[PDB]
């Protein structure tokens, strides 16, 4: 089963995909998500990506500490102390981001559904 897996799943009300874990198989292609912020919703398998971590060379949206957002490209993954960090390149410069600071826009997550989606 997919229960217990880390995924990146769409939040339908804004179209963005967020990291979380499947907690239940609701049936018929639907799954219960527990997002990493503690929000929970049912999500269709087609809107769930099996990528823990989000892949190298993927376009993502990085969250900066003052509620700004920007696109960047994943160039690294690191483990430090049981936690995942992403190295994100924007305009030739790389910066590190914690897992919750990296999300996918609708257009960024849709690109991945073929290879990673649970549809």
CATH 2.30.30.30 domain span(s) along the chain: 55-119
- CB distance 9 to 18 below 8 Å: yes
CATH of domain 55-119: 2.30.30.30
CATH 2.30.30.140 domain span(s) along the chain: 1-54
Place of tokens 């897996």: 5
Strand partners, 80: 83
Give the contacts of 119 (CB within 8 A, at least 6 positions apart): 29, 44, 45, 46, 113
- CB distance 11 to 112 below 8 Å: no
Q: What is the resolution of this structure in A?
A: 1.2
CA 34 to chain centre: 12
**Residue 10: which of 35, 37, 38, 29 has the closest Cα?**
35
Domain 1-54 fold is SH3 type barrels. (2.30.30)
Q: Establish how many alpha carbons lie within 13 A of residue 64's alpha carbon, considering only the half-sphere containing its beta carbon.
A: 8
Whether omega before 53 lies within 30 degrees of 0, making that bond cis, reads yes
Neighbours of 74 (CB within 10 A): 20
The dihedral through the CA atoms of 40, 8, 109, 67 has a sign that is positive
Solved with? X-ray
How close are the terminal C-alpha atoms of the chain, in Å?
Answer: 14
Place of tokens 């769930």: 48
């Amino acid at each position: 089963s997919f229960v217990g897996l880390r995924v990146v799943a769409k939040w339908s009300s804004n179209g963005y995909f967020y990291s979380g874990k499947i907690t239940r198989d609701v049936g018929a292609g639907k799954y219960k998500l527990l997002f990493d912020d503690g929000y929970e919703c049912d999500v269709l398998g087609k809107d769930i990506l099996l990528c823990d971590p989000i892949p190298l060379d993927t376009e993502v949206t990085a969250l900066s500490e003052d509620e700004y957002f920007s696109a960047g490209v994943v160039k690294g993954h690191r483990k430090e102390s049981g936690e995942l960090y992403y190295s994100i390149e924007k305009e030739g410069q790389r910066k590190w981001y914690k897992r919750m600071a990296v999300i996918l826009s609708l257009e960024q997550g849709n690109r991945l559904r073929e290879q990673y989606g649970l549809g």
